Write an enzyme that holds these catalytic residues in place. Sequence first.
Site, PDB file in Angstrom:
ATOM      1  N   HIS B  30      42.917  44.414  36.380  1.00 46.68           N
ATOM      2  CA  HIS B  30      42.916  42.987  36.656  1.00 46.68           C
ATOM      3  C   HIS B  30      42.647  42.151  35.414  1.00 46.68           C
ATOM      4  CE1 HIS B  30      38.544  43.305  36.514  1.00 46.68           C
ATOM      5  NE2 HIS B  30      38.543  41.990  36.410  1.00 46.68           N
ATOM      6  N   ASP B  52      43.387  48.771  40.918  1.00 44.16           N
ATOM      7  CA  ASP B  52      42.931  47.961  39.794  1.00 44.16           C
ATOM      8  C   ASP B  52      42.652  48.798  38.558  1.00 44.16           C
ATOM      9  OD1 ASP B  52      42.123  45.877  38.202  1.00 44.16           O
ATOM     10  OD2 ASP B  52      40.515  45.196  39.528  1.00 44.16           O
ATOM     11  N   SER B 104      34.213  44.281  31.680  1.00 44.05           N
ATOM     12  CA  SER B 104      34.565  44.879  32.952  1.00 44.05           C
ATOM     13  C   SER B 104      35.323  46.177  32.824  1.00 44.05           C
ATOM     14  CB  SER B 104      35.428  43.909  33.748  1.00 44.05           C
ATOM     15  OG  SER B 104      36.797  44.076  33.418  1.00 44.05           O
TER      16      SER B 104
END
Lengths: 52, 152, 48
Positions: B30, B52, B104
């Site tokens: 993402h 993802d 992330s």
Amino acid sequence: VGMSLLALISIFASCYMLVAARSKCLTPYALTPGAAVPWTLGILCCAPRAHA
Amino acid sequence: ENDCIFEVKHEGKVTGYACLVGDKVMKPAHVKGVIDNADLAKLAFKKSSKYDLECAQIPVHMRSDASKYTHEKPEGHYNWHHGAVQYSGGRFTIPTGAGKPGDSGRPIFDNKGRVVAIVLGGANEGSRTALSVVTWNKDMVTRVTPEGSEEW
Amino acid sequence: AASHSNVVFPDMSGTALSWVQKISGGLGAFAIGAILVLVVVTCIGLRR
């Protein structure tokens, strides 16, 4: 009217029995801490989409 | 383990990182951007919306700078670039705030030094924010998302 | 002059539309098989 009413009672009673079976088989798995819900029963009955 | 986590760049700033594990380069799908290493940036990457995780095969030369992996996840204490994480009851927990949105990609190691997880997000809660992570079970890769986790 | 009402569309079980029937039947059976296999895979994925 009578035949249609009897057909409706039959359909509704059968569907209620089906959803009752859904409950009686899935509620033992919703009260457990670990939502296993093995994909056999997950597909065979619409699975609650347990949220890890 | 500094030369195994590669950052992903967007208009001049690190917006996440792409990790190098197990003969596979992988990244949180993402997050947008481009791999900082140009040699690795020109590789084709197969995305997956429902997982993802966008991955590809590491070039044969640089396989050496890739970490070791595991699938067996005992209850206990694991590492992170921000302090430590705890694995318990099929969840990963960190001290709240330790996780900032934007880092992330970075991985979660184990005590023995081998990647066990790839963070994607956080589900903020109490003193311990849960980490929505994509793990690898023995043959599948599986997403664990607690409710309300926000994409980092 | 013609002694029939000029209606020409063959009725079913004549060889022409029977051929169309068999082609459509087989192709649509393969299509519904594709639908079924997609449903099975995606349901397994939904639960797995």
